[PDB]
Motif scaffolding. Structure first.
Motif, short mmCIF file in Angstrom:
data_model
loop_
_atom_site.label_atom_id
_atom_site.label_comp_id
_atom_site.label_asym_id
_atom_site.label_seq_id
_atom_site.Cartn_x
_atom_site.Cartn_y
_atom_site.Cartn_z
N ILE A 136 0.84 -1.19 0.00
CA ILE A 136 0.00 0.00 0.00
C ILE A 136 0.87 1.24 0.00
N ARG A 137 0.50 2.22 -0.82
CA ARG A 137 1.12 3.55 -0.81
C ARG A 137 2.62 3.47 -1.08
N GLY A 138 3.08 2.37 -1.67
CA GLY A 138 4.50 2.24 -1.93
C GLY A 138 5.35 2.35 -0.68
N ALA A 139 4.90 1.74 0.42
CA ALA A 139 5.68 1.66 1.65
C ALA A 139 6.25 0.26 1.78
N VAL A 140 7.54 0.18 2.11
CA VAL A 140 8.26 -1.09 2.14
C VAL A 140 8.32 -1.58 3.58
N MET A 141 7.94 -2.84 3.78
CA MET A 141 8.10 -3.45 5.08
C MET A 141 9.58 -3.62 5.39
N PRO A 142 9.97 -3.52 6.66
CA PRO A 142 11.36 -3.81 7.01
C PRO A 142 11.67 -5.28 6.83
N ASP A 143 12.79 -5.73 7.40
CA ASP A 143 13.26 -7.10 7.26
C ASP A 143 13.04 -7.59 5.83
N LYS A 144 13.22 -6.70 4.87
CA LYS A 144 13.07 -7.00 3.46
C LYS A 144 14.26 -6.43 2.71
N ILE A 145 14.90 -7.27 1.91
CA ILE A 145 16.17 -6.95 1.26
C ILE A 145 16.09 -7.39 -0.19
N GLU A 146 16.38 -6.46 -1.10
CA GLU A 146 16.50 -6.73 -2.52
C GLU A 146 17.91 -6.44 -2.99
N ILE A 147 18.43 -7.33 -3.83
CA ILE A 147 19.80 -7.23 -4.32
C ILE A 147 19.80 -7.36 -5.83
N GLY A 148 20.64 -6.57 -6.47
CA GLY A 148 20.80 -6.62 -7.92
C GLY A 148 22.17 -7.15 -8.29
N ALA A 149 22.23 -7.89 -9.39
CA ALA A 149 23.48 -8.51 -9.83
C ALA A 149 24.08 -7.76 -11.02
#
Lengths: 158, 103, 209, 81
Positions: free
Chosen positions: C196-209
RNA sequence: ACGGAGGGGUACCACCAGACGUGGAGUCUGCGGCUCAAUCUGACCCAACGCGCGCACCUCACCAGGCCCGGACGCGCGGAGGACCGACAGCCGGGCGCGCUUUCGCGAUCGCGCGGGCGGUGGUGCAUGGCCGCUCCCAGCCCGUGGCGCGAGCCGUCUGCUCCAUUGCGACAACGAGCGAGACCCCGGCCGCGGGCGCCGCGGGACGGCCCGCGCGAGCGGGAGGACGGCGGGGCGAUAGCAGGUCUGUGAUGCCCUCAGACGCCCUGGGCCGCACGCGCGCUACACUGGCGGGGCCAGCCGGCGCCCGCGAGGACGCGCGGAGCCCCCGCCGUGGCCGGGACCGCGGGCUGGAACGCCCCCGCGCACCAGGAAUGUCUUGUAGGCGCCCGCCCCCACCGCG
């Protein structure tokens, strides 16, 4: 009656403004809820708390505790300059330690050769570390289980 | 012409009250208004028993309401009666942020 | 240096309108259930009052010739000692109803009062929510469903978080009471939407290669 | 704190794998900057970034001293002979 | 599930080492019993007993007595040739045109019977929702595919090593995911920028990062510099469940009972405070590490003052302005139930309020009490303990509770 964060204090609006501009230096010391503000300048060895000389203070027993930095550092330096501290906050002893911390930092802020400053810092901290670094611990809140931070209301099993 | 005016702002959330501020001050640079005086926070406090009745361990709730207040009174001569409305319109009206004006 | 008895005027003038807001919310929730009332918000203006409503379909409450709504405006003038015509009410509409628990629970109560079975209704609500885009939804029914002894059964699908500060945003809960022949039947709902509303939950990690 | 949840480990790994050359084994400021960098990843918090960076450092030296299981460092070159 | 079975772990609601207490006296308060017209009730190991947020009236349910219908809405009947309702005077009545003896007034707002309502701190918490407490100051719980069993079920989800912690490393007919934990939010400590009636807005900073030992490893022990060194204090809080508590919080409620001499609503008094008795949470003391008299002097949640009377408590006026105990210093007392202790009681002056049974001040009187048996509670840094200060309820009142 004085909170320690008031603008009148950190600025020392008590002093008349024309002379205010002479006190180049500023400083701070604290302990618990207690604050010390030292406006320092050149002089001939004088000191004052809340319009009171240093000898005639209320800790007749801890007068030496206040005077320690003078004796450990020598006399010529302090004779060189002059002060007028003001303090405001909880208790008497807290104010004593705040004052002595403020004095140490202010006199140690006056030198211009940082090598001398380092040597003096080493000489001083050896005697004690709390003359230079503020004490962190502070009063802890209480909980509704009982009438104290950690103690609890006496429990009867029968 | 010149009247010496004051602006009051009240709110319970810190974000909008910090967003209304930027808009208004950005809008008033020309008229001569200046920043705010952030006032002491008013803390409403209520402790209530967590139960509708006396039972079990005595556990308490601790509700509170913070109210934030920013006061610009720096319009004064720089703004006339009509020109005040110029400043209270371009801003982004928020559904809850009462703003009162009084010379 | 300053007098604390004046600013108390403003402070007490911002507390009064908050209480004004809630009474309206209760009144709406008890009246505009046919319009899918969700919530109410109020912008106290110095000139008048402007009220922004949240209904699934305002046209219903809006009324032919806006008669019903205008009737409503005058009514609230009497209670709040405000002059009518200064109590303008604006309606707004909701699109992602599946993202809102209140509408779905109202629908569920409507279904249940028809004697519709509980399982079918609850799972209809749930597939509705997941169709609208949802990472989870949980439903509950407690009361005297069948026999004199009372027990509760809960339905669900995907994950739902129930701890922390994130529960104060991404998790929307709602409840109601149903007065039926045997006795009160209690139902409650909760939907979890992490995006919702483009809010990111914590304990969440995205990585790019 | 000695708590190292899975997230930290897996993230620190993928980060070292996908990005080695830009880093050093014992540093914590350079590694912190690399993590903060946008191309590599995104960390909503600050404490999380610090923890992930520290674990990255410890993995990096555990590797540089000697090869470590589960790490796609690209080391076939010296053994493909 | 249990074991007066074995093996690993853990915690001041467990102990070791210690500290401060309680149980001993008087008192505040609640609780059982006794009493009364009534002394309204709920709750009984931890998980009931200053708890259901201050009982002169109300609150209020209970006791002794009295006005009112505030009987919605439909059918039949009657009603203005008068449906229903008020009053001067005098008695009786605590008092009221409540009632009694006349005699004036108002006018359909209805009245009677039948159906049917409203209301009720009335009952059932062992018919219910919701909200709390406890299991639980834990670390556990389940999904899809697959495999083993006729099956209830098992593997996954660990007879290894670490972690406060199903927290992690490394293996395994298992593979791959999720919740819970952590992450998260508030507070404080150090620094920077900005702004400013009043110190308040945004950010940085600490991460088992560095050195040394070990350990494949996860990680353990020590030493540094640093404001802070290894979960600093709180909030939120998994699945499943208890015949736990609450119908006396509610236009939350099912079924019964009350429903015009009313358990409806309103008024006058009284009670909830009554006392041979057992105990639970507290308060004050047993004194020289002290009591009394004078003086000096610093807090924070936060916060209102001048003049004049009166010993004081308080009072009459008029304006917006403001912080204490311990402690320190000088003296008196000098081991005596004495100037320790101030319960109890007797004149008096005031406040609150419609009304003291409530609360303050002055003089006098001056109970036990010489550190408290069997038993038992809490606690690791700004902590225990000691000292005082604000808010809650509140017309006055804090030995209570949150801070």
């Amino acid at each position: 009656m004085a909170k320690g964060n008031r603008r009148d204090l950190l600025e020392r609006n008590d002093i008349e403004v024309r002379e205010r501009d002479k006190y180049t230096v500023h400083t701070l010391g604290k302990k618990k809820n207690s604050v010390a503000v030292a406006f320092v300048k050149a002089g001939k060895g004088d000191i004052l708390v809340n319009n009171v000389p240093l000898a005639l203070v209320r800790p007749e027993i801890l007068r030496t505790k206040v005077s320690e930095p003078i004796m450990i550092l020598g006399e010529s330096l302090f004779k060189g300059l002059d002060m007028n501290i003001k303090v405001a906050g909880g208790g008497h002893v807290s104010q004593i330690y705040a004052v002595r911390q403020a004095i140490s930092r202010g006199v140690l802020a006056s030198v211009k050769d940082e090598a001398a400053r380092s040597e003096l810092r080493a000489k001083l901290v050896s005697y004690d570390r709390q003359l230079v670094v503020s004490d962190p611990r502070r009063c802890e809140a209480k909980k509704f289980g009982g009438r104290g931070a950690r103690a609890r209301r006496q429990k009867s099993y029968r | 012409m010149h009247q010496k005016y004051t602006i009051i702002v009240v709110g319970k959330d810190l974000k909008l009250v910090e967003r209304y501020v930027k808009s208004i001050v950005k809008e008033g640079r020309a008229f001569g208004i200046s920043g705010p005086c952030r006032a002491p926070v008013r803390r409403l406090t209520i402790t209530t028993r967590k139960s509708p009745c006396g039972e079990g361990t005595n556990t308490w709730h601790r509700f509170e309401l913070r109210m934030y207040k920013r006061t610009f009174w720096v319009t004064c001569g720089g703004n006339d009666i009509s020109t005040i409305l110029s400043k209270t319109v371009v801003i982004p009206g928020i559904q809850v942020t009462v703003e009162v004006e009084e010379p | 240096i300053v007098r604390r008895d004046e600013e108390n005027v403003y402070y007490s003038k911002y507390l009064n309108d908050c209480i004004m807001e809630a009474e309206l919310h209760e009144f709406f929730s008890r009246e505009l259930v046919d319009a899918g009332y969700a919530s109410c918000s109020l912008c106290r203006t110095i000139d008048s009052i402007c009220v922004i409503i949240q209904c699934a379909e305002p046209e219903v409450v809006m009324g032919d010739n806006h008669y019903r709504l205008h009737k409503i405006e005058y009514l609230l003038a009497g209670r709040f000692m405000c002059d009518p015509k200064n109590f303008n009410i604006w309606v707004d509409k909701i699109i992602k109803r599946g993202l809102s628990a209140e509408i779905m629970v109202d629908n569920l109560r409507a279904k249940l009062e028809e004697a519709m079975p509980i399982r079918r209704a609850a799972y209809s609500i749930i597939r509705t929510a997941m169709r609208a885009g949802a990472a989870g939804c949980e439903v509950i029914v407690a009361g005297k469903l069948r026999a004199q002894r009372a027990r509760a059964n809960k339905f669900k699908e995907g994950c739902l978080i129930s701890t922390g500060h994130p529960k104060r945003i991404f998790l929307a809960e709602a409840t109601r009471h149903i007065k039926m022949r045997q006795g009160v039947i209690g139902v409650k709902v909760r939907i979890y939407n992490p995006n919702i509303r483009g809010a990111v939950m914590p304990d969440k990690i995205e990585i790019g290669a | 704190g000695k708590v190292r949840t899975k997230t930290i480990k897996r993230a620190a790994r993928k980060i070292v794998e996908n990005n080695y050359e830009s880093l050093k084994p014992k540093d914590f400021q350079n590694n912190k900057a690399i993590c903060s960098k946008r191309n590599v990843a995104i960390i909503p918090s600050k404490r999380l970034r610090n923890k992930v960076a520290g674990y990255v450092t410890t993995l990096m030296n555990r590797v540089v001293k000697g090869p470590v299981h589960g790490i796609s460092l690209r080391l076939q070159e010296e053994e493909r002979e």
